[PDB]
């Protein structure tokens, strides 16, 4: 397939803007019918109508819904399709021509999308009990992944967390014995395109029962009512892009089932379940996984909130100690800050605390050569404000590349005293605290992350900047009186 | 006559009743306590003859095989070996015909086994429903409606514990032809502290019949330790007759309470009352426990967001007010005096009181400028730049003159010998609540009214933050305009 490889390589270059929401084909484990809400006439049909029902698709475009689905169920789907929210709808199991079909309903731009999924072949209280029993966030991730693996029966279960600029991190992983391990792996934001992220934000479950699937087209590809393509954003039977199918092939997973974790409308992460054999997931399993996803999304938000509030709680305690730390014979407040560096390091969070004063420089922790530090302090005038924050110093100050491991994100405060002053913080690179062991591959994904996240340190959160601007006022209140009170 | 007097004497010790050590259990099951190494019947319940029809006198210390049979004894011996009695599946058995569900726990180095009687998919839908809720009141209404539908209880109420442990019926769904309780604040004395500790320890409390005769635990003292068995973690525990009388006077004969615990603190309760006795199966109890846990997680989620959401809008109006004073230099708070609502909404208030000498400037609630002088004259004894009041009727002896107008007063006054001051008010909680013999919801409301006489809602930690965040702003901005 030399021609196909060239055609595929075209998709690889143009993958950040492919029309995922408008594939024009569905996965072949069911049927899709687009209908009209008032009369329920078959507006669009799938190519499997002859495969599972044995009806020629040419005579379906427009004609009666009774023709293929039977008049018996037509009234049922009319009644369940009456003017309603359709948000909460009970299960609707059917059987036409001896084929078991589960009917799911939604609406897309004044159309009734009917998804006839094919059918082949108590513990909840326990799962929520264990989820509540978790103490810390890492324990919560571990127990959640273990429980999802146990109940689903999926070979691999992974929790991706989207940290910064869309980059991902595999936090918790449980896998079947003797199979590839992914933990501490960081993948770039380019791996998941933005359209896929929007769909994951608008859908709880994404099921790909078989990567070796041939897409079946929707005939006709154009809806006569609007003369466009179907928006399959909310359809469970939506074709997967060949790029992700190749990615799953290279991984070794043939069936996937992703559960989205949404906090405050933002995609916190994903729960990805992979199988080495094509696995078909029943409705009960889907509902249980959705329930665990929502419960964990609620719980994760709570655990960080307690931890975020805890950091604020131990912040003001840290400043209070520091606000009185210079109570004894301080030549400068900074020289009083030189007694115990770890209080400064723990105030804002950084491996390097350096305060330059008295024609010399005082640094504790991960710091560069002192001569170049004043050159970084020579850049203080460029800020124009005591506060300074950066998650990437190389991009904003070009000669700050010699020290990327020691100083990638620098927090600073400088009192307006013109002679010699300023406080400097040093946070190391993210690349120096990450450990893990073809184009579309997890190993290749890690290398792109190490080049995309170059010289980038973890962003100083609003609390750290608040704890930074706080000492700006505290040092200004005290330092001037210290010299004045001597006189 | 004699029995009625014994009831009143019991009402004296309702505050410090030994609930954890009743010495009897509800008659809808059996209780045994056993030694872990041997599994011998250390202490038994009096209702053995009721179901098993066996003498109890030769059971204190004997082997379990004579009561529960050899096979079931071995099964529970294997179950109790090292399972830690946490996350243990259902263990239904049947001795002498009667089916018993065997729940297990351990108390002070003893193995308590409860044989509860056996009389007579939607969870995902309810979790989706609770996630779909947008506001807090919508969340409470949805939770109560779904809980009532799933459990089939005539009354389902959610109590929120506010201020000094007082109660508030936040949401309520009830069957027709039943008294309505909404906004019915009740005192903290209605639920004693021991009951609150037990509700914190146990998710579920089930009283299937208020008209029950307790079965005593014989012998009443464990020979191993010579004390009363602690039933603080057992579903089969006798309830105090005070609560039984309260439930009879309410008009409920069966109760099913799920405790909402946020961060180890009893946020509230989900009380399910029935007009007739009712028994809840294990599946129903597990489902209600799961919904309670989900709602406890979700209440904290929306509470935390609104705590932060109020902080973002606190700074938003904070910048606007501290940049306004640049327009007017006649008074340091003249710009503060142009938008009174931007001052009331800054911290939560129904009246702004900013006044210097020879001036009277208060918008909204204000008793009298002459009393405002006396209101401004309180600070001689308690003098700080930021002063707050949770109950002004106590700290200020003439706090009862204006309680509906100013019950909790938050005050900032910059340090200047010349007259100054910024003060905001807050009215009574008792003047914003409305609702329609000794142990009765009607009586409970009038006790709360007396117990809250001039008590305003506590100034939040973010509320005193906006008081100190306006301490620095008015301090620095004053000199530049004067200069
Ligand atoms: C520009 C196009 C590309 C692309 C497309 C693409 N990816 C997904 C889904 C993915 N891909 C993931 C990639 C990974 N990177 C890693 O390091 C690891 C290892 C653990 C993985 C799996 C990934 C995590 C997802 C999300 C899956 C989930 O759990 O939901 C899609 C969406 C497909 C769809 O139809 O929904 C697309 C279009 N992948 C590329 O690699 C680049 C070239
Ligand atoms: C000092 C003794 C008293 C007391 C004891 C008592 N009460 C409970 C449980 C209660 N009582 C509640 C009271 C209410 N107040 C109201 O306004 C309303 C109506 C809306 C009610 C129902 C109340 C809410 C509870 C908790 C219910 C639950 O089961 O969770 C107990 C606990 C009993 C036990 O064994 O668990 C005790 C000991 N009640 C009094 O009135 C005072 C005199």
TrEMBL record, chain A:
Q: What class of enzyme is it?
A: transferase
GO CC terms for this protein? plasma membrane
* Signal peptide start and end residues: none
> Which protein, by its recorded name, is this?
histidine kinase
Any idea which GO molecular function terms this record carries? ATP binding; phosphorelay sensor kinase activity; photoreceptor activity
According to UniProt, the reaction catalysed is: ATP + protein L-histidine = ADP + protein N-phospho-L-histidine
- Cysteine pairs forming cystine bridges in this chain are 363-367
Swiss-Prot/TrEMBL GO biological process terms = detection of visible light; regulation of DNA-templated transcription
Covered part of the full sequence, start to end and full length, is 2 to 514 of 745
Can you give the residue ranges of the Phytochrome chromophore attachment site domain? Answer: 136-294
What family is it from?
In the N-terminal section; belongs to the phytochrome family.
Domain of life where this protein originates = Bacteria
Q: List the EC numbers from the record.
A: 2.7.13.3
Which key words tag this protein in UniProt? ATP-binding, Chromophore, Kinase, Nucleotide-binding, Phosphoprotein, Photoreceptor protein, Receptor, Sensory transduction, Transferase, Two-component regulatory system
């Amino acid at each position: 397939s030399q021609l196909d490889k060239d055609a595929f390589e075209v998709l690889l270059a143009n993958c950040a803007d492919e029309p995922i929401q408008f594939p024009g084909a569905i996965q072949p484990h069911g049927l899709l019918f687009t209908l009209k809400e008032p009369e329920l006439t078959i507006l669009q049909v799938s190519a499997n109508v002859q495969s599972v029902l044995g009806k020629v698709p040419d005579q379906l475009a427009g004609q009666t819904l009774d023709c293929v689905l039977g008049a018996g169920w037509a009234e049922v789907i009319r009644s369940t399709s009456a003017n309603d929210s359709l948000v909460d709808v009970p299960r609707l199991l059917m059987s036409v021509e001896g084929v078991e079909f589960e009917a799911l309903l939604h609406r897309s731009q004044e159309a009734l999308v009917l998804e006839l999924e094919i059918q082949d072949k108590g513990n909840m209280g326990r799962m929520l009990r264990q989820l509540h029993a978790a103490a810390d966030l890492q324990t919560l991730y571990e127990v959640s992944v273990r429980e999802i693996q146990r109940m689903t029966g999926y070979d691999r279960v992974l929790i991706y967390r989207f940290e910064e600029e869309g980059h991902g991190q595999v936090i918790a992983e449980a896998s079947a014995p003797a199979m590839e391990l992914f933990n501490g792996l960081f993948f770039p934001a380019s791996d998941i395109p933005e359209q896929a992220r929007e769909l994951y934000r608008r859908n709880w479950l994404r099921i790909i029962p078989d990567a070796n699937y041939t897409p079946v087209p929707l005939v006709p590809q154009l809806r006569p009512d609007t003369q466009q393509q179907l928006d399959l954003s909310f359809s469970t039977l939506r074709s997967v892009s060949p790029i992700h199918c190749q990615y799953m092939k290279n991984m070794g997973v043939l069936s996937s089932m992703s559960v989205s974790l949404i906090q405050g409308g933002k995609l916190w992460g994903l729960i990805s379940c992979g199988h080495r054999t094509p696995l078909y997931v029943s409705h009960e399993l889907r509902s249980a996984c959705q329930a665990i996803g929502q419960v964990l999304s609620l719980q994760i938000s709570a655990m960080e909130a307690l931890e975020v509030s805890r950091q604020r709680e131990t912040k003001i305690q840290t400043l209070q100690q520091l606000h009185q730390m210079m109570a004894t014979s301080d030549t400068d407040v900074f020289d009083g800050l030189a007694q115990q560096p770890q209080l400064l390091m723990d105030l804002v969070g950084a491996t390097g605390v350096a305060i330059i004063e008295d024609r010399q420089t005082h640094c504790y922790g991960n710091c560069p050569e002192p001569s170049d530090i004043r050159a970084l302090h020579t850049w203080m005038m460029a800020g124009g404000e005591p506060v300074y924050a950066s998650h990437h110093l190389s991009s904003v100050y070009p000669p700050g590349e010699a020290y990327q491991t020691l100083a990638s994100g620098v927090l600073a405060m400088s009192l307006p005293k013109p002679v010699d002053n300023g406080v400097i913080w040093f946070r190391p690179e993210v690349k120096q605290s990450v450990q893990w062991s073809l184009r579309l591959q997890p190993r290749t994904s890690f290398e792109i992350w190490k080049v995309e996240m170059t010289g980038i340190a973890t962003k100083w959160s609003h609390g750290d900047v608040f704890a930074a601007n706080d000492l700006r006022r505290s040092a200004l209140e005290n330092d001037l009186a210290r010299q004045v009170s001597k006189e």
